[PDB]
Design an enzyme around this catalytic site. Structure first.
Site, short mmCIF file in Angstrom:
data_model
loop_
_atom_site.label_atom_id
_atom_site.label_comp_id
_atom_site.label_asym_id
_atom_site.label_seq_id
_atom_site.Cartn_x
_atom_site.Cartn_y
_atom_site.Cartn_z
N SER A 1 5.95 -75.96 6.11
CA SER A 1 7.07 -75.30 5.46
C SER A 1 6.97 -73.78 5.52
O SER A 1 7.23 -73.09 4.54
CB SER A 1 7.14 -75.77 4.00
OG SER A 1 5.89 -75.63 3.36
N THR B 1 3.01 -67.42 6.21
CA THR B 1 4.35 -66.88 5.99
C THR B 1 4.63 -66.28 4.61
O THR B 1 5.11 -65.15 4.51
CB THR B 1 5.43 -67.93 6.28
OG1 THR B 1 5.36 -68.31 7.66
CG2 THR B 1 6.82 -67.37 5.99
N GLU C 1 4.83 -49.89 14.05
CA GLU C 1 3.56 -50.60 13.99
C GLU C 1 2.72 -50.19 15.19
O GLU C 1 3.26 -49.89 16.26
CB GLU C 1 3.79 -52.12 14.03
CG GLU C 1 4.33 -52.69 12.72
CD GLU C 1 3.23 -53.19 11.80
OE1 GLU C 1 2.10 -52.67 11.88
OE2 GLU C 1 3.52 -54.10 11.00
N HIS D 1 -8.58 -58.75 11.68
CA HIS D 1 -8.02 -57.53 11.12
C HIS D 1 -9.24 -56.74 10.65
O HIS D 1 -10.11 -57.28 9.97
CB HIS D 1 -7.08 -57.83 9.95
CG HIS D 1 -6.27 -56.65 9.51
ND1 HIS D 1 -6.82 -55.55 8.89
CD2 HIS D 1 -4.94 -56.38 9.65
CE1 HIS D 1 -5.87 -54.66 8.66
NE2 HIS D 1 -4.73 -55.14 9.11
N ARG E 1 -8.11 -51.13 16.48
CA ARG E 1 -8.44 -52.16 15.49
C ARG E 1 -9.72 -52.90 15.82
O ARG E 1 -10.65 -52.96 15.00
CB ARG E 1 -7.29 -53.17 15.36
CG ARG E 1 -5.99 -52.59 14.83
CD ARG E 1 -5.07 -53.69 14.28
NE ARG E 1 -3.71 -53.19 14.06
CZ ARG E 1 -2.75 -53.87 13.43
NH1 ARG E 1 -3.01 -55.07 12.93
NH2 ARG E 1 -1.54 -53.34 13.29
N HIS F 1 -7.62 -63.31 11.25
CA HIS F 1 -6.24 -63.05 10.86
C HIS F 1 -5.17 -63.90 11.53
O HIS F 1 -4.28 -64.43 10.86
CB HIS F 1 -5.97 -61.57 11.12
CG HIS F 1 -4.62 -61.10 10.67
ND1 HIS F 1 -4.23 -61.11 9.35
CD2 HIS F 1 -3.61 -60.53 11.36
CE1 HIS F 1 -3.04 -60.56 9.24
NE2 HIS F 1 -2.63 -60.20 10.45
N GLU G 1 2.51 -70.52 14.59
CA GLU G 1 1.11 -70.25 14.91
C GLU G 1 0.31 -71.46 15.42
O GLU G 1 -0.75 -71.28 16.04
CB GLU G 1 0.39 -69.63 13.71
CG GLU G 1 -0.96 -69.03 14.07
CD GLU G 1 -1.60 -68.24 12.94
OE1 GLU G 1 -0.85 -67.63 12.15
OE2 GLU G 1 -2.84 -68.20 12.85
N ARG H 1 -2.40 -60.71 20.03
CA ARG H 1 -1.06 -60.67 19.43
C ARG H 1 -0.65 -59.24 19.10
O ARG H 1 -1.47 -58.43 18.68
CB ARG H 1 -1.03 -61.49 18.12
CG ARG H 1 0.31 -61.42 17.39
CD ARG H 1 0.18 -61.66 15.88
NE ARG H 1 -0.68 -60.67 15.23
CZ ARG H 1 -0.37 -60.00 14.12
NH1 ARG H 1 0.80 -60.20 13.52
NH2 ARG H 1 -1.22 -59.12 13.61
#
Ligand SMILES: Cc1cc2nc3c(=O)[nH]c(=O)nc-3n(C[C@H](O)[C@H](O)[C@H](O)COP(=O)(O)OP(=O)(O)OC[C@H]3O[C@@H](n4cnc5c(N)ncnc54)[C@H](O)[C@@H]3O)c2cc1C
Ligand SMILES: [Cl-]
Length: 472
Positions: free
Chosen positions: A7, A37, A102, A212, A257, A313, A337, A348
């Site tokens: 969901s 999400t 970003e 991350h 990163r 992440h 995902e 990504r």
């Protein structure tokens, strides 16, 4: 009846879209508000800016993809972004006019709605699913039945065997929770992915797990600290107060990163505790309102050092699918995902994940009435593996093993340890961890989020995927 497992943005948008296309749909999820999400606080990428374009968006995506991006998929997703966003807005959702920026993007193209875009999208989609009369059931998928390489049914924890299935859409998300340090909810252990594997579904790019670099967890609330903080003067030091980063890269807090992730990873592996210092940022409250709020509710003065940590992440791989979301198993779709459309390659691009889920979900009705196409493995090497044994590991142990032996920095010895630990297990969490380690060992090079100190360079001979298929 069409069944959708999960969901999140992927499962929900597909559900609403399929329902509107006249299909009978049922949504099943082990935790309605679980997954990544609901807690996504950034935005959705879409080249709708006057200075942007699908091709530029594609170029930025391909760049971070480090050569593993499926070009066809990238072009499809980036060229669909605008009309998919517009369709979503016609449903009654409105993004803000200001396009955010970003890292990795050449132009501003990130759509937002409040400081909790993911949450907003989730509630909105849930509201539409309810008004469309779509049943939303809280149950857990545990098995998938297949005959002649086609889905025939599936089993859930609570209701058992389900036999009336014309199509099964897997939208169960990734397995980033299988790492000691994770930024997502405990639901993300990749069981949906493992279950599909057990039913003969082909998996790929399992070794490209994205981490991350700066995450915190005050009072248990996970929160990603944007790299913009470092751009405005944020400092990173260990418990001694020294800016160790400089010892790994001369760019310091301003390194990529993955660079900080590796530096921080090593430092912590020594037993050092890492923190971020925001006291030297001018006009902090004006520049970072969301960070300020997070810190405020935890009673943490933003002038005091904050405990941080790198964390699993996003997983680039999973169920290989074509642009429609079709896996190799007839009538079994994978979106979001849990799938590997090849959009992300070896890394990504921020904001492309919520976009991916929304595109495959909203566009799904476009293909559900056509003959199945399936996938091609010509872009990689297929490895058949047999899962057999009774060794059982705790979730806590698996997460520590993956963090240490299948983490930010890898090498043969550690990978082999991980491989041997999971080899004799049939547990879903063990299988997923096994394939990731196996692939990471096979890929003797460093590419994207996959870094090996024993093979620190990119091998042009490895510009191909590593596919996995289960055999007896
Ligand atoms: C903190 C954080 C912030 C992020 N921010 C962004 C962002 O700003 N922009 C961006 O593009 N991407 C971001 N990402 C990724 C993003 O938020 C997407 O939601 C994600 O990549 C996948 O969405 P999805 O629908 O496929 O799955 P999820 O939203 O993860 O779906 C998982 C669903 O499947 C269910 N499920 C799992 N297993 C089972 C099972 N066995 N049976 C039944 N149901 C099951 C779960 O309960 C859940 O409902 C972020 C990730 C994290 C962790
Ligand atoms: Cl993001």
């Amino acid at each position: 009846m069409i069944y959708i497992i999960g969901s999140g943005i992927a499962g929900l948008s597909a559900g609403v879209a399929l329902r509107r296309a006249g299909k009978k749909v049922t949504l099943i999820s082990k935790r309605i508000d679980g997954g990544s999400t609901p807690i996504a606080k950034g935005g959705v990428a879409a080249s709708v800016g006057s200075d942007d374009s699908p091709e530029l968006h594609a170029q930025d995506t391909i760049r971070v993809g480090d050569g593993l991006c499926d070009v066809k998929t990238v072009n499809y997703v980036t060229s669909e972004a605008k009309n998919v966003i517009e369709t979503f807005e016609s449903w009654g959702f409105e993004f803000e006019e200001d396009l955010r920026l970003e890292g990795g993007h050449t132009k501003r193209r990130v759509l937002h709605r409040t400081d909790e875009t993911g949450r907003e999208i989730f509630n909105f989609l849930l509201k539409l699913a309810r008004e469309e009369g779509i049943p939303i059931i809280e149950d857990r998928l545990v098995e998938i039945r297949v005959k002649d390489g086609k889905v025939t049914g599936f089993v859930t924890e609570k209701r058992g065997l389900v036999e009336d299935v014309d199509k099964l859409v897997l939208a169960t998300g990734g397995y980033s929770y299988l790492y000691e340090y994770s930024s997502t909810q405990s639901t993300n252990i990749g069981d949906g992915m493992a279950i599909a594997f057990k039913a003969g579904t082909i998996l790929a790019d399992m070794e490209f797990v994205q981490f991350h670099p700066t995450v915190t967890s005050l009072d248990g609330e996970v929160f990603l600290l944007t790299e913009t903080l470092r751009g405005e003067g944020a400092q990173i030091i260990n418990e001694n107060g020294e800016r160790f980063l400089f010892n790994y890269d001369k760019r310091g807090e301003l390194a990529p990163r993955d660079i900080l992730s590796r530096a921080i990873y090593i430092e912590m592996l020594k037993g050092h505790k890492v923190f971020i210092d925001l006291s030297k940022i001018e006009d902090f409250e004006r520049k970072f309102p969301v960070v300020a709020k997070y810190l405020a509710r935890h009673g943490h003065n933003y002038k005091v050092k904050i405990p941080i940590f790198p964390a699993a992440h996003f997983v680039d791989g999973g169920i290989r699918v074509n642009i429609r979301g079709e896996s190799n198993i007839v009538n079994l779709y994978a979106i979001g995902e849990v799938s590997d459309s090849g959009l992300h390659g070896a890394n990504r691009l921020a904001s492309n994940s919520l976009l991916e889920g929304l595109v495959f979900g909203i566009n799904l009705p476009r293909y559900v009435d056509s003959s199945w196409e399936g996938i091609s493995t010509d872009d990689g090497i297929v490895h058949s593996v047999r899962i057999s044994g009774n060794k059982t590991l705790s979730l806590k142990e698996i997460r520590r093993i993956n963090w240490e032996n299948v983490g930010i920095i890898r090498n043969e010895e550690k990978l082999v340890k991980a491989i041997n630990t999971y080899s004799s297990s049939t547990q879903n969490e063990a299988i997923i961890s096994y394939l990731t380690a196996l692939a990471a060992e096979i890929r003797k090079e460093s590419r994207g989020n996959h870094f090996r100190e024993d093979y620190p360079y990119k091998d042009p001979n490895w510009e191909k995927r590593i596919y996995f298929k289960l055999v007896v």
